Design an enzyme around this catalytic site. Structure first.
Site, mmCIF file in Angstrom:
data_model
loop_
_atom_site.group_PDB
_atom_site.id
_atom_site.type_symbol
_atom_site.label_atom_id
_atom_site.label_comp_id
_atom_site.label_asym_id
_atom_site.label_seq_id
_atom_site.Cartn_x
_atom_site.Cartn_y
_atom_site.Cartn_z
ATOM 1 N N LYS B 32 -10.911 7.849 -12.042
ATOM 2 C CA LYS B 32 -9.367 7.924 -11.429
ATOM 3 C C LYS B 32 -9.842 6.875 -11.244
ATOM 4 O O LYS B 32 -10.116 5.549 -10.126
ATOM 5 C CB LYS B 32 -9.375 8.339 -10.079
ATOM 6 C CG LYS B 32 -7.694 8.075 -9.276
ATOM 7 C CD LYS B 32 -7.058 8.985 -8.428
ATOM 8 C CE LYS B 32 -7.369 8.305 -7.495
ATOM 9 N NZ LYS B 32 -7.447 6.619 -6.928
ATOM 10 N N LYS B 62 0.466 3.797 -9.520
ATOM 11 C CA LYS B 62 1.509 3.999 -9.085
ATOM 12 C C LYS B 62 2.631 3.568 -9.732
ATOM 13 O O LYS B 62 2.776 2.370 -8.455
ATOM 14 C CB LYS B 62 0.798 3.754 -7.589
ATOM 15 C CG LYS B 62 -0.176 4.374 -6.885
ATOM 16 C CD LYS B 62 -0.209 4.659 -5.109
ATOM 17 C CE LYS B 62 -1.423 5.628 -5.115
ATOM 18 N NZ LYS B 62 -3.053 5.468 -5.816
ATOM 19 N N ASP B 65 8.421 0.869 -11.249
ATOM 20 C CA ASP B 65 8.872 -0.520 -11.477
ATOM 21 C C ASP B 65 10.608 0.084 -12.282
ATOM 22 O O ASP B 65 10.733 1.596 -12.482
ATOM 23 C CB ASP B 65 8.344 -0.648 -12.642
ATOM 24 C CG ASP B 65 8.762 -2.820 -13.279
ATOM 25 O OD1 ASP B 65 10.431 -2.648 -13.012
ATOM 26 O OD2 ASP B 65 8.296 -3.534 -11.744
ATOM 27 N N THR B 69 10.451 -1.223 -17.563
ATOM 28 C CA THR B 69 9.091 -2.077 -17.464
ATOM 29 C C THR B 69 8.110 -0.672 -17.440
ATOM 30 O O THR B 69 7.219 -0.490 -17.536
ATOM 31 C CB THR B 69 8.877 -2.798 -15.973
ATOM 32 O OG1 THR B 69 10.390 -3.722 -16.452
ATOM 33 C CG2 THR B 69 8.087 -3.272 -16.218
ATOM 34 N N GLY B 184 -14.359 9.075 -3.552
ATOM 35 C CA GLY B 184 -14.744 8.290 -4.307
ATOM 36 C C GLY B 184 -16.292 7.109 -3.016
ATOM 37 O O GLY B 184 -17.003 7.954 -3.806
ATOM 38 N N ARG B 185 -15.126 6.328 -2.328
ATOM 39 C CA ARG B 185 -16.945 6.296 -0.780
ATOM 40 C C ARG B 185 -17.519 7.243 -1.285
ATOM 41 O O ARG B 185 -19.356 6.489 -1.078
ATOM 42 C CB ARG B 185 -15.994 5.829 0.076
ATOM 43 C CG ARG B 185 -15.520 4.439 -0.397
ATOM 44 C CD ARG B 185 -14.181 3.777 1.238
ATOM 45 N NE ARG B 185 -13.326 4.752 1.217
ATOM 46 C CZ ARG B 185 -12.375 4.689 2.042
ATOM 47 N NH1 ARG B 185 -12.381 3.338 2.580
ATOM 48 N NH2 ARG B 185 -11.253 5.822 1.367
HETATM 49 O O1 LIG Z 1 -3.151 9.843 0.801
HETATM 50 C C1 LIG Z 1 -3.963 9.055 1.118
HETATM 51 N N1 LIG Z 1 -4.291 8.422 2.548
HETATM 52 C C2 LIG Z 1 -5.428 7.376 2.609
HETATM 53 O O2 LIG Z 1 -5.479 7.240 4.066
HETATM 54 C C3 LIG Z 1 -6.000 7.275 1.490
HETATM 55 N N2 LIG Z 1 -7.893 7.045 1.699
HETATM 56 C C4 LIG Z 1 -8.455 7.069 0.262
HETATM 57 N N3 LIG Z 1 -6.754 7.466 -0.600
HETATM 58 C C5 LIG Z 1 -7.191 8.226 -1.479
HETATM 59 O O3 LIG Z 1 -8.290 9.196 -1.949
HETATM 60 C C6 LIG Z 1 -8.898 8.779 -2.775
HETATM 61 C C7 LIG Z 1 -11.162 8.803 -2.163
HETATM 62 O O4 LIG Z 1 -11.382 7.795 -1.255
HETATM 63 P P1 LIG Z 1 -11.990 8.331 -0.574
HETATM 64 O O5 LIG Z 1 -12.667 6.449 -1.051
HETATM 65 O O6 LIG Z 1 -12.652 8.047 0.650
HETATM 66 O O7 LIG Z 1 -12.901 9.685 -0.987
HETATM 67 C C8 LIG Z 1 -8.621 6.893 -3.055
HETATM 68 O O8 LIG Z 1 -9.325 6.143 -4.687
HETATM 69 C C9 LIG Z 1 -6.870 6.953 -2.932
HETATM 70 O O9 LIG Z 1 -6.337 7.883 -4.216
HETATM 71 C C10 LIG Z 1 -5.975 8.163 0.786
HETATM 72 N N4 LIG Z 1 -5.184 9.189 0.006
#
Ligand SMILES: O=c1[nH]c(=O)c2[nH+]cn([C@@H]3O[C@H](COP(=O)(O)O)[C@@H](O)[C@H]3O)c2[nH]1
Ligand SMILES: O=c1[nH]c(=O)c2[nH+]cn([C@@H]3O[C@H](COP(=O)(O)O)[C@@H](O)[C@H]3O)c2[nH]1
Lengths: 214, 204
Positions: B32, B62, B65, B69, B184-185
């Site tokens: 993603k 996300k 629009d 568009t 992600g992180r």
């Molecule tokens: O509803 C949400 N509230 C949050 O506070 C939040 N923080 C992260 N994300 C989404 O989670 C994906 C993975 O994030 P991480 O790096 O924390 O794993 C990211 O890529 C986001 O799409 C959030 N979604």
């Protein structure tokens, strides 16, 4: 800002976009650019408009993510050369604040989009419009973007944000719109004109005739 | 989705993004990406992920629009190679419809974002979530994105969209309701991305 007229450069092919913008540069210095052009031609197109024409660019990206991501979108966008970015308010105060923080740090501007008027906007947007605008006021937002059409909604928005806030919106125009908005956004009527520079000239004349104070 | 684990590649520079991706490809096949990366490196990076790593790409743009568009945004995104795009429901059914029609025409997919859980989502988003999810059901949406939340909450979302719909959400309990979890992180900031991913997958 210049002549209270903002060009909505919505063409997607780089040549026509550059051509039309340069042609009206005498009368318009502010141009609004959206994602379709940017995603097809690259963010460098923003840098090109600014560098080449010295115009001010408003990135109509309708930012609508969580705070940390909004911050990154704004940074990349301001780094590319945009003077301002349009942000959604539906995602909440935190998400808007993140954009304001980057704009502050980099010396740029945020425009808060308070409502839309397209079909379907009545499902969730219309009902939250006043509250989103009031949230912007509470956040210290100074620039706003109006939906479109319906001059009666525009009067309402102006009443909420005050006379000090900056308000822009698309289109008896330009007069009807400028009774409340500080600048009118115009696209097709200019970029599809046989003589874009002529269309812009004509509108600017109409605007000057209004003798708008301040 | 390979191993029910989607990598959220939120880095902004091509070198780190490509590096982490190639290191976790033996574990993850769906990535993603967001505007931070594509605006910083160009939409052409999407083709790089697919041609070089064979990754399915979900564009987390996300989209929010007007119909016309949204149509253009989706067409440019699918043209660049995205397999799917994430769209907001708050702008209404027609805006979502426009995205779904481009997907139908180009053979791709649309994911409807039903809710978000960041600190401000309680103002307007939380209250619209169930209606937005139901709206997706009536528009024929088959792919949904849920918020980062307690697994019990996804139970309700799942009841609304049905068993056949595909659901992904940020993350074992979550997978009791979501078909895949997004991480992600924990993975892309790791000194050893492969080990991080492998460890998450082992937790099953
Ligand atoms: O509803 C949400 N509230 C949050 O506070 C939040 N923080 C992260 N994300 C989404 O989670 C994906 C993975 O994030 P991480 O790096 O924390 O794993 C990211 O890529 C986001 O799409 C959030 N979604
Ligand atoms: O709420 C809206 N509903 C619509 O149907 C609509 N059509 C255009 N626009 C916006 O107006 C800018 C200028 O459009 P024109 O080419 O019609 O002047 C465009 O660039 C858009 O920002 C709309 N906004």
């Amino acid at each position: 800002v210049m002549n209270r007229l903002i060009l909505a450069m919505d063409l997607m092919n780089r040549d026509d976009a550059l051509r039309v913008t340069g042609e009206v540069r005498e009368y318009i210095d502010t141009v609004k650019i959206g994602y379709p052009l940017v995603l097809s031609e690259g963010m460098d197109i923003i840098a090109e408009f600014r560098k080449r024409f010295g115009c001010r660019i408003i990135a109509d990206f309708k930012v609508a993510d969580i705070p940390e991501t909004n911050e990154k979108i704004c940074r990349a966008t301001f780094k590319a050369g945009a003077d301002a970015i349009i942000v959604h308010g539906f995602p909440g105060a935190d998400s808007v604040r993140a954009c304001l923080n980057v704009a502050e740090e980099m010396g740029r501007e945020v425009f808060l989009l308070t409502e839309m008027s397209h079909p379907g906007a009545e499902m969730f947007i219309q009902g939250a419009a006043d509250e989103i605008a009031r949230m912007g006021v509470d956040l210290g937002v100074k620039n706003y973007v109006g939906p479109s059409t319906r001059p009666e909604r525009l009067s309402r928005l102006r009443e909420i944000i005050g006379q000090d806030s900056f308000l822009i919106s698309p289109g008896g125009d330009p007069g009807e719109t400028l009774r409340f908005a500080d600048a009118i956004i115009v696209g097709r009527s200019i970029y599809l004109a046989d003589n874009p520079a002529a269309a812009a000239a004509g509108i600017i004349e109409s605007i000057k005739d209004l003798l708008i104070p301040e």
